[PDB]
Design an enzyme around this catalytic site. Sequence first.
Site, PDB file in Angstrom:
ATOM      1  N   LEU A   1      29.384  17.979  37.335  1.00  0.00           N
ATOM      2  CA  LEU A   1      30.356  18.649  38.188  1.00  0.00           C
ATOM      3  C   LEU A   1      30.532  17.792  39.442  1.00  0.00           C
TER       4      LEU A   1
ATOM      5  N   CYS B   1      34.849  12.261  43.108  1.00  0.00           N
ATOM      6  CA  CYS B   1      34.109  11.954  44.326  1.00  0.00           C
ATOM      7  C   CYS B   1      32.774  11.227  44.110  1.00  0.00           C
TER       8      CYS B   1
ATOM      9  N   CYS C   1      35.114   8.951  46.631  1.00  0.00           N
ATOM     10  CA  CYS C   1      34.541   9.017  47.977  1.00  0.00           C
ATOM     11  C   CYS C   1      33.161   8.399  48.134  1.00  0.00           C
TER      12      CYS C   1
ATOM     13  N   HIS D   1      25.055  13.530  40.945  1.00  0.00           N
ATOM     14  CA  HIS D   1      25.465  14.286  39.762  1.00  0.00           C
ATOM     15  C   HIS D   1      24.442  15.369  39.454  1.00  0.00           C
TER      16      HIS D   1
ATOM     17  N   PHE E   1      25.166  11.141  76.521  1.00  0.00           N
ATOM     18  CA  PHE E   1      25.302   9.714  76.812  1.00  0.00           C
ATOM     19  C   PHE E   1      24.155   8.896  76.200  1.00  0.00           C
TER      20      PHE E   1
HETATM   21  C1  LIG Z   1      38.851   5.388  45.815  1.00  0.00           C
HETATM   22  C2  LIG Z   1      39.021   6.780  46.427  1.00  0.00           C
HETATM   23  C3  LIG Z   1      38.374   7.092  47.662  1.00  0.00           C
HETATM   24  C4  LIG Z   1      38.476   8.349  48.299  1.00  0.00           C
HETATM   25  N1  LIG Z   1      37.806   8.582  49.528  1.00  0.00           N
HETATM   26  C5  LIG Z   1      37.955   9.893  50.113  1.00  0.00           C
HETATM   27  C6  LIG Z   1      37.297  10.106  51.300  1.00  0.00           C
HETATM   28  O1  LIG Z   1      36.585   9.250  51.909  1.00  0.00           O
HETATM   29  N2  LIG Z   1      37.459  11.405  51.842  1.00  0.00           N
HETATM   30  C7  LIG Z   1      38.209  12.431  51.271  1.00  0.00           C
HETATM   31  O2  LIG Z   1      38.278  13.534  51.836  1.00  0.00           O
HETATM   32  N3  LIG Z   1      38.861  12.189  50.076  1.00  0.00           N
HETATM   33  C8  LIG Z   1      38.729  10.940  49.516  1.00  0.00           C
HETATM   34  N4  LIG Z   1      39.374  10.700  48.319  1.00  0.00           N
HETATM   35  C9  LIG Z   1      40.159  11.690  47.637  1.00  0.00           C
HETATM   36  C10 LIG Z   1      39.363  12.743  46.902  1.00  0.00           C
HETATM   37  O3  LIG Z   1      38.512  12.000  45.978  1.00  0.00           O
HETATM   38  C11 LIG Z   1      40.177  13.705  46.072  1.00  0.00           C
HETATM   39  O4  LIG Z   1      41.173  14.362  46.852  1.00  0.00           O
HETATM   40  C12 LIG Z   1      39.435  14.876  45.409  1.00  0.00           C
HETATM   41  O5  LIG Z   1      38.379  14.281  44.602  1.00  0.00           O
HETATM   42  C13 LIG Z   1      40.263  15.664  44.475  1.00  0.00           C
HETATM   43  O6  LIG Z   1      39.513  16.733  43.910  1.00  0.00           O
HETATM   44  P1  LIG Z   1      40.077  17.595  42.736  1.00  0.00           P
HETATM   45  O7  LIG Z   1      39.087  18.626  42.474  1.00  0.00           O
HETATM   46  O8  LIG Z   1      41.485  18.023  43.001  1.00  0.00           O
HETATM   47  O9  LIG Z   1      40.077  16.461  41.595  1.00  0.00           O
HETATM   48  P2  LIG Z   1      38.897  15.586  40.936  1.00  0.00           P
HETATM   49  O10 LIG Z   1      37.709  15.652  41.835  1.00  0.00           O
HETATM   50  O11 LIG Z   1      39.462  14.231  40.696  1.00  0.00           O
HETATM   51  O12 LIG Z   1      38.438  16.220  39.583  1.00  0.00           O
HETATM   52  C14 LIG Z   1      39.295  16.676  38.544  1.00  0.00           C
HETATM   53  C15 LIG Z   1      38.317  17.130  37.478  1.00  0.00           C
HETATM   54  O13 LIG Z   1      38.972  17.675  36.294  1.00  0.00           O
HETATM   55  C16 LIG Z   1      38.446  17.059  35.116  1.00  0.00           C
HETATM   56  N5  LIG Z   1      39.477  16.982  34.122  1.00  0.00           N
HETATM   57  C17 LIG Z   1      40.691  16.236  34.079  1.00  0.00           C
HETATM   58  N6  LIG Z   1      41.389  16.423  32.991  1.00  0.00           N
HETATM   59  C18 LIG Z   1      40.643  17.334  32.234  1.00  0.00           C
HETATM   60  C19 LIG Z   1      40.832  17.942  30.966  1.00  0.00           C
HETATM   61  N7  LIG Z   1      41.903  17.698  30.202  1.00  0.00           N
HETATM   62  N8  LIG Z   1      39.856  18.827  30.508  1.00  0.00           N
HETATM   63  C20 LIG Z   1      38.755  19.102  31.252  1.00  0.00           C
HETATM   64  N9  LIG Z   1      38.484  18.543  32.517  1.00  0.00           N
HETATM   65  C21 LIG Z   1      39.549  17.650  32.892  1.00  0.00           C
HETATM   66  C22 LIG Z   1      37.897  15.728  35.600  1.00  0.00           C
HETATM   67  O14 LIG Z   1      37.074  15.181  34.619  1.00  0.00           O
HETATM   68  C23 LIG Z   1      37.357  16.021  36.933  1.00  0.00           C
HETATM   69  O15 LIG Z   1      36.011  16.497  36.944  1.00  0.00           O
HETATM   70  C24 LIG Z   1      39.295   9.375  47.619  1.00  0.00           C
HETATM   71  C25 LIG Z   1      39.943   9.057  46.389  1.00  0.00           C
HETATM   72  C26 LIG Z   1      39.816   7.803  45.803  1.00  0.00           C
HETATM   73  C27 LIG Z   1      40.554   7.589  44.495  1.00  0.00           C
HETATM   74  C1  LIG Z   2      14.312   4.700  80.224  1.00  0.00           C
HETATM   75  C2  LIG Z   2      15.296   5.838  80.510  1.00  0.00           C
HETATM   76  C3  LIG Z   2      16.238   6.214  79.512  1.00  0.00           C
HETATM   77  C4  LIG Z   2      17.182   7.248  79.678  1.00  0.00           C
HETATM   78  N1  LIG Z   2      18.081   7.562  78.632  1.00  0.00           N
HETATM   79  C5  LIG Z   2      19.019   8.632  78.883  1.00  0.00           C
HETATM   80  C6  LIG Z   2      19.893   8.927  77.861  1.00  0.00           C
HETATM   81  O1  LIG Z   2      19.937   8.339  76.733  1.00  0.00           O
HETATM   82  N2  LIG Z   2      20.803   9.982  78.147  1.00  0.00           N
HETATM   83  C7  LIG Z   2      20.859  10.697  79.339  1.00  0.00           C
HETATM   84  O2  LIG Z   2      21.698  11.601  79.476  1.00  0.00           O
HETATM   85  N3  LIG Z   2      19.968  10.377  80.351  1.00  0.00           N
HETATM   86  C8  LIG Z   2      19.070   9.363  80.116  1.00  0.00           C
HETATM   87  N4  LIG Z   2      18.182   9.039  81.125  1.00  0.00           N
HETATM   88  C9  LIG Z   2      18.145   9.682  82.407  1.00  0.00           C
HETATM   89  C10 LIG Z   2      19.280   9.324  83.340  1.00  0.00           C
HETATM   90  O3  LIG Z   2      19.268   7.862  83.443  1.00  0.00           O
HETATM   91  C11 LIG Z   2      19.141   9.878  84.734  1.00  0.00           C
HETATM   92  O4  LIG Z   2      19.032  11.300  84.730  1.00  0.00           O
HETATM   93  C12 LIG Z   2      20.297   9.619  85.714  1.00  0.00           C
HETATM   94  O5  LIG Z   2      20.481   8.174  85.756  1.00  0.00           O
HETATM   95  C13 LIG Z   2      20.036  10.015  87.100  1.00  0.00           C
HETATM   96  O6  LIG Z   2      21.187   9.732  87.896  1.00  0.00           O
HETATM   97  P1  LIG Z   2      21.163   9.821  89.448  1.00  0.00           P
HETATM   98  O7  LIG Z   2      22.509   9.554  89.910  1.00  0.00           O
HETATM   99  O8  LIG Z   2      20.516  11.081  89.922  1.00  0.00           O
HETATM  100  O9  LIG Z   2      20.174   8.545  89.746  1.00  0.00           O
HETATM  101  P2  LIG Z   2      20.195   6.923  89.418  1.00  0.00           P
HETATM  102  O10 LIG Z   2      18.740   7.210  89.429  1.00  0.00           O
HETATM  103  O11 LIG Z   2      21.410   7.348  88.704  1.00  0.00           O
HETATM  104  O12 LIG Z   2      20.540   6.385  90.857  1.00  0.00           O
HETATM  105  C14 LIG Z   2      19.963   6.723  92.112  1.00  0.00           C
HETATM  106  C15 LIG Z   2      20.697   5.755  93.010  1.00  0.00           C
HETATM  107  O13 LIG Z   2      20.340   5.852  94.417  1.00  0.00           O
HETATM  108  C16 LIG Z   2      20.042   4.544  94.929  1.00  0.00           C
HETATM  109  N5  LIG Z   2      19.072   4.656  95.974  1.00  0.00           N
HETATM  110  C17 LIG Z   2      17.714   5.066  95.957  1.00  0.00           C
HETATM  111  N6  LIG Z   2      17.139   5.033  97.125  1.00  0.00           N
HETATM  112  C18 LIG Z   2      18.124   4.583  98.001  1.00  0.00           C
HETATM  113  C19 LIG Z   2      18.149   4.327  99.391  1.00  0.00           C
HETATM  114  N7  LIG Z   2      17.074   4.507 100.172  1.00  0.00           N
HETATM  115  N8  LIG Z   2      19.337   3.873  99.957  1.00  0.00           N
HETATM  116  C20 LIG Z   2      20.449   3.680  99.193  1.00  0.00           C
HETATM  117  N9  LIG Z   2      20.509   3.907  97.804  1.00  0.00           N
HETATM  118  C21 LIG Z   2      19.232   4.370  97.334  1.00  0.00           C
HETATM  119  C22 LIG Z   2      19.626   3.734  93.709  1.00  0.00           C
HETATM  120  O14 LIG Z   2      19.626   2.369  94.026  1.00  0.00           O
HETATM  121  C23 LIG Z   2      20.501   4.238  92.636  1.00  0.00           C
HETATM  122  O15 LIG Z   2      21.772   3.586  92.529  1.00  0.00           O
HETATM  123  C24 LIG Z   2      17.170   7.953  80.975  1.00  0.00           C
HETATM  124  C25 LIG Z   2      16.222   7.579  81.973  1.00  0.00           C
HETATM  125  C26 LIG Z   2      15.311   6.554  81.754  1.00  0.00           C
HETATM  126  C27 LIG Z   2      14.352   6.248  82.893  1.00  0.00           C
HETATM  127  O1  LIG Z   3      27.981   5.838  86.839  1.00  0.00           O
HETATM  128  S1  LIG Z   3      28.257   6.259  85.490  1.00  0.00           S
HETATM  129  O2  LIG Z   3      27.401   7.363  85.145  1.00  0.00           O
HETATM  130  O3  LIG Z   3      29.724   6.387  85.260  1.00  0.00           O
HETATM  131  C1  LIG Z   3      27.920   4.968  84.296  1.00  0.00           C
HETATM  132  C2  LIG Z   3      26.546   4.448  84.094  1.00  0.00           C
HETATM  133  S2  LIG Z   3      26.548   3.431  82.586  1.00  0.00           S
HETATM  134  O1  LIG Z   4      32.998  18.468  46.436  1.00  0.00           O
HETATM  135  S1  LIG Z   4      31.793  18.451  45.633  1.00  0.00           S
HETATM  136  O2  LIG Z   4      30.676  18.985  46.365  1.00  0.00           O
HETATM  137  O3  LIG Z   4      32.043  19.027  44.271  1.00  0.00           O
HETATM  138  C1  LIG Z   4      31.352  16.739  45.286  1.00  0.00           C
HETATM  139  C2  LIG Z   4      31.058  15.885  46.483  1.00  0.00           C
HETATM  140  S2  LIG Z   4      29.952  14.532  46.056  1.00  0.00           S
HETATM  141  O1  LIG Z   5      31.071   5.219  78.754  1.00  0.00           O
HETATM  142  S1  LIG Z   5      31.326   5.409  80.168  1.00  0.00           S
HETATM  143  O2  LIG Z   5      32.564   4.780  80.553  1.00  0.00           O
HETATM  144  O3  LIG Z   5      31.142   6.829  80.574  1.00  0.00           O
HETATM  145  C1  LIG Z   5      30.040   4.577  81.115  1.00  0.00           C
HETATM  146  C2  LIG Z   5      29.914   3.095  80.938  1.00  0.00           C
HETATM  147  S2  LIG Z   5      29.300   2.308  82.448  1.00  0.00           S
END
Ligand SMILES: Cc1cc2nc3c(=O)[nH]c(=O)nc-3n(C[C@H](O)[C@H](O)[C@H](O)COP(=O)(O)OP(=O)(O)OC[C@H]3O[C@@H](n4cnc5c(N)ncnc54)[C@H](O)[C@@H]3O)c2cc1C
Ligand SMILES: Cc1cc2nc3c(=O)[nH]c(=O)nc-3n(C[C@H](O)[C@H](O)[C@H](O)COP(=O)(O)OP(=O)(O)OC[C@H]3O[C@@H](n4cnc5c(N)ncnc54)[C@H](O)[C@@H]3O)c2cc1C
Ligand SMILES: O=S(=O)(O)CCS
Ligand SMILES: O=S(=O)(O)CCS
Ligand SMILES: O=S(=O)(O)CCS
Lengths: 522, 522
Positions: free
Chosen positions: A77, A81, A86, A136, A500
């Site tokens: 079934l 896809c 897909c 499958h 972020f």
């Molecule tokens: C290369 C490719 C890539 C794609 N990528 C995406 C994607 O990334 N995202 C997305 O959303 N869609 C994608 N699609 C589209 C998606 O695959 C189709 O819209 C969807 O599979 C259609 O489902 P369906 O149930 O209508 O038909 P199908 O899933 O094609 O199935 C029809 C079924 O009926 C059966 N059948 C046919 N004739 C008979 C018969 N006479 N007796 C008994 N059974 C029969 C078949 O054997 C089959 O099981 C892609 C399509 C292709 C071709």
């Molecule tokens: C390793 C690491 C990874 C992280 N990863 C994520 C993540 O993936 N996603 C997420 O949402 N958060 C993440 N965080 C947290 C996030 O970076 C902080 O919460 C955020 O940067 C704090 O912002 P802020 O403006 O308060 O301070 P910053 O700490 O943003 O800046 C404070 C500012 O004040 C300045 N400053 C300090 N003292 C003085 C002074 N005396 N005079 C003038 N300027 C001063 C500094 O120079 C600096 O520019 C991470 C933190 C760390 C440490």
């Molecule tokens: O100062 S901002 O929080 O816009 C970006 C840090 S990457």
């Molecule tokens: O849409 S179905 O779940 O039948 C198949 C996706 S692999």
């Molecule tokens: O992705 S954002 O533009 O928010 C920050 C990069 S400095």
Amino acid sequence: KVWNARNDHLTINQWATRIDEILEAPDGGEVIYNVDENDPREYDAIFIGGGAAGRFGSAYLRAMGGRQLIVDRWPFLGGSCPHNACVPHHLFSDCAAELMLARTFSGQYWFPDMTEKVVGIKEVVDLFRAGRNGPHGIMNFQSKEQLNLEYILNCPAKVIDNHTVEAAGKVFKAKNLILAVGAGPGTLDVPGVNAKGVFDHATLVEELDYEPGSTVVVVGGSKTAVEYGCFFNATGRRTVMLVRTEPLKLIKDNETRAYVLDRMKEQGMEIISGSNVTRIEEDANGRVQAVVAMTPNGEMRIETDFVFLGLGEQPRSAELAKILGLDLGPKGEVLVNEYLQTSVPNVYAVGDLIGGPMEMFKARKSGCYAARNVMGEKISYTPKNYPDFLHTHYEVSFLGMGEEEARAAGHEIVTIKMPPDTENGLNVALPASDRTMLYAFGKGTAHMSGFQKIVIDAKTRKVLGAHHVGYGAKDAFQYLNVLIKQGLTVDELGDMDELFLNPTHFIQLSRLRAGSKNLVSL
Amino acid sequence: KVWNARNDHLTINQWATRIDEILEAPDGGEVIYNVDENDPREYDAIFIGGGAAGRFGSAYLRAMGGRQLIVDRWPFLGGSCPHNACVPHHLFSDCAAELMLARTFSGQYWFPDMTEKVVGIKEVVDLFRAGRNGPHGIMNFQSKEQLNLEYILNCPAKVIDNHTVEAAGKVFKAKNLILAVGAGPGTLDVPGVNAKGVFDHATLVEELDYEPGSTVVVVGGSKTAVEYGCFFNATGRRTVMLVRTEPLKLIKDNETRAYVLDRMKEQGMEIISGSNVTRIEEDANGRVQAVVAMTPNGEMRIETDFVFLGLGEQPRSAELAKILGLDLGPKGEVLVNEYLQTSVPNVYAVGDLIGGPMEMFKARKSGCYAARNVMGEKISYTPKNYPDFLHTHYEVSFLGMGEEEARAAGHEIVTIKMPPDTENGLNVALPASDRTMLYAFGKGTAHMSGFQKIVIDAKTRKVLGAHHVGYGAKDAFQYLNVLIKQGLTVDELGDMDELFLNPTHFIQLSRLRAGSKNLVSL
Ligand SMILES: Cc1cc2nc3c(=O)[nH]c(=O)nc-3n(C[C@H](O)[C@H](O)[C@H](O)COP(=O)(O)OP(=O)(O)OC[C@H]3O[C@@H](n4cnc5c(N)ncnc54)[C@H](O)[C@@H]3O)c2cc1C
Ligand SMILES: Cc1cc2nc3c(=O)[nH]c(=O)nc-3n(C[C@H](O)[C@H](O)[C@H](O)COP(=O)(O)OP(=O)(O)OC[C@H]3O[C@@H](n4cnc5c(N)ncnc54)[C@H](O)[C@@H]3O)c2cc1C
Ligand SMILES: O=S(=O)(O)CCS
Ligand SMILES: O=S(=O)(O)CCS
Ligand SMILES: O=S(=O)(O)CCS
Ligand SMILES: O=S(=O)(O)CCS
């Protein structure tokens, strides 16, 4: 020849193994009969086809308490896809993205030298063939053990009339019929089209018994053609795409489309628009040796032993339309009303069988809506204002209006995008996040870090469109689209909690402008 | 020593270059003075610190039509994020994910042999140092040319009183002060802590002049400790994490946490909970040679020449609290009311300076809310019910309640997850999507394809929590959380348009169960 599996309970992995065996079975394999012969109830609907539309429709119908039966010619079934659509496409796209990364940083750090390195296409396809039975198995298992569905697999259905169907040598009656046979690969009417070396998505994963040469010719400008084309190019082969009109017209935003196309050309892909294949040359061995096509600049010839056709699929309506007398559309699609009902009483049509958009969400949803109508719940379905995406070497997501499109429509707009419009252009360390960090920090690679933009109505402050090129935003677009359809403003977007660094920077960038009563682009 | 850049207009790349030069300037570099001396208006607020909180607060205040001034001791805006926090952390996580992929498929296809392959840590840090000026340049550029902000950089601020601040040898008056100096690295009170080879996030990107040995000791169980730890492990080094309590308590869902920890151990990471460092051994050269810690099973000694401290950061409140007389909290955080106001009149505090959660969304939003209050718009801010995430070798996203947590709270619940609970366990080809396809199809790697789950209230049908391990869902959680806070049901989730294959399968899986009035887990 008929295996009564009803009382059998195979695991996911046991199902996987059994399915593979039936698929490899030279005699064709046994029929998988999973019917509850003790249930006295009449079938509310018999689904012809158990793919995305048929499986989901059955799941929903059964969930509502009705009785269904699926009949599918395949031993599993899920439809196309998992077998040739897909799923394999996403495996290939993953490779395309990984290969671009490896080629960009060839040699550096832990990356090996990719110069003069050609990846084996058959190797990857073989990987897919070797593991496609996994999904499958889950499908047969989930369907039988978790969704309580009845089905007969590895058996073509014989529709007698609008209430009668023959399967496994037996006759079944139902109150309704739900046609879900999907669509088949498009055909190309040119000489040599049947030469060895010419493939489409279906035959590629079934008949590739050799490793392709250094050049690949892709015919079509569809998603499939682009997705498969970027993969072939990523393997290190010269890839030429012959597009009848213009490529990726699906990407409405001009800047977004240009970025996507520019990056493809930068990877070495050659895109020829306004081209029509005239002949596929066969060698003395019946093997493809070259492709000839007419282009705006005249006729050209490309030597190759591998051709991939990425044409649109066509609804499998011929037989059913004759047996039942169904009204068909311009492209062979079965015509249906807003309730998925065909011209024949008690007969519904869903999935790719009813035309575009040919996407999984459309197939599954139409299947469920048909089921609800069959169960007495009158509900209409007309797909519109949905998000969409496609793969190149990047993930490309889009929804709503493009920038030019919105202005043309009469909307006063401002945009928020990254990178900004400056004389340094794309050559800056933004946008950036998971999977684009190396590009953002690499020497001469900053322009490859991505592109994104949201289109906002200056007066209503509502988001009219969102576009993104990079990685990790596709999933987000599913939910973002719902918010947008509910009326999302730059202020509300700005008031959300971002994670972020985020693939989409729409939240914090919106916050940077939301404080002004008079919006200004960023 | 004072460069009046007001009338100068540098490009993003020119700013990047200038900033790097000032940072490398042996004499310390010139002061970047960007003040509009023709504007007669009084400053509504002077921001002490121009990081996430200070830059965004200024952006929003200026956007509302008020006048602001930022003073920062660094020659760039953006704070710790681009210089030594979020940004470098994501670069490292990208490497960690890519390396796990390369090691899992070592040799196969285009992947090189990773056996006995150690990646250079210093190489990657050097990559970061070489490109961190890119983001810096955009920040100075965007701030000055696009956000119209006034600022004095590369100059420590001297706060005179609650309305007076000295910068660039001049005195400035303001109606309000917004303290945004953030927090500094936590300290560890043990002997040898100052030995060469002991680093934290800040010193790692400033003082790593050698390539670490084969063993790495990470102290802490925070996000940073785990994120950096997985990267060190991915480079091929034995990585030992010493956690005081239990690791990743932030992941409330038990199954989700177990999957994450299991995958980390599978990569060879050693996690020791209930451990406290007692001494860091120095060799005759003042270099780290080993770490001694007390564990539940007793005292242990780990030889290493590289130690990374991932302790919590501490608010930089000491000086300001003395000058202004600010009331401080248990952990040195500046106390503020719901309007971000401190105990001193006209003085606000934001960002990491006011404590946890120490995240970018909290810093930026608190900064903007303080600005709005300063401009007369009384608005309160209290962060709660926000999504969250962290990196291991995978992206880990979570929001709402874990499964056990919900039941304990009195909710009757059902769950929808992948993979399903069967005797084959995790060893199945699902879940799967972008970046997990190879794992899903590889031999013996299916269990690495991911894990995900949504917790639903059986009676209200509302989603109470979402959890995901894999790639490409982080961005989605930002928007999904908004929908959930608005009251999202399994039926509404099921009625959305999915983009298959999707990182999160919540939509279609919900649809599979939504047809029943009586919900059943999947
Ligand atoms: C290369 C490719 C890539 C794609 N990528 C995406 C994607 O990334 N995202 C997305 O959303 N869609 C994608 N699609 C589209 C998606 O695959 C189709 O819209 C969807 O599979 C259609 O489902 P369906 O149930 O209508 O038909 P199908 O899933 O094609 O199935 C029809 C079924 O009926 C059966 N059948 C046919 N004739 C008979 C018969 N006479 N007796 C008994 N059974 C029969 C078949 O054997 C089959 O099981 C892609 C399509 C292709 C071709
Ligand atoms: C390793 C690491 C990874 C992280 N990863 C994520 C993540 O993936 N996603 C997420 O949402 N958060 C993440 N965080 C947290 C996030 O970076 C902080 O919460 C955020 O940067 C704090 O912002 P802020 O403006 O308060 O301070 P910053 O700490 O943003 O800046 C404070 C500012 O004040 C300045 N400053 C300090 N003292 C003085 C002074 N005396 N005079 C003038 N300027 C001063 C500094 O120079 C600096 O520019 C991470 C933190 C760390 C440490
Ligand atoms: O100062 S901002 O929080 O816009 C970006 C840090 S990457
Ligand atoms: O849409 S179905 O779940 O039948 C198949 C996706 S692999
Ligand atoms: O992705 S954002 O533009 O928010 C920050 C990069 S400095
Ligand atoms: O991802 S889904 O579980 O919907 C389909 C895989 S067969």
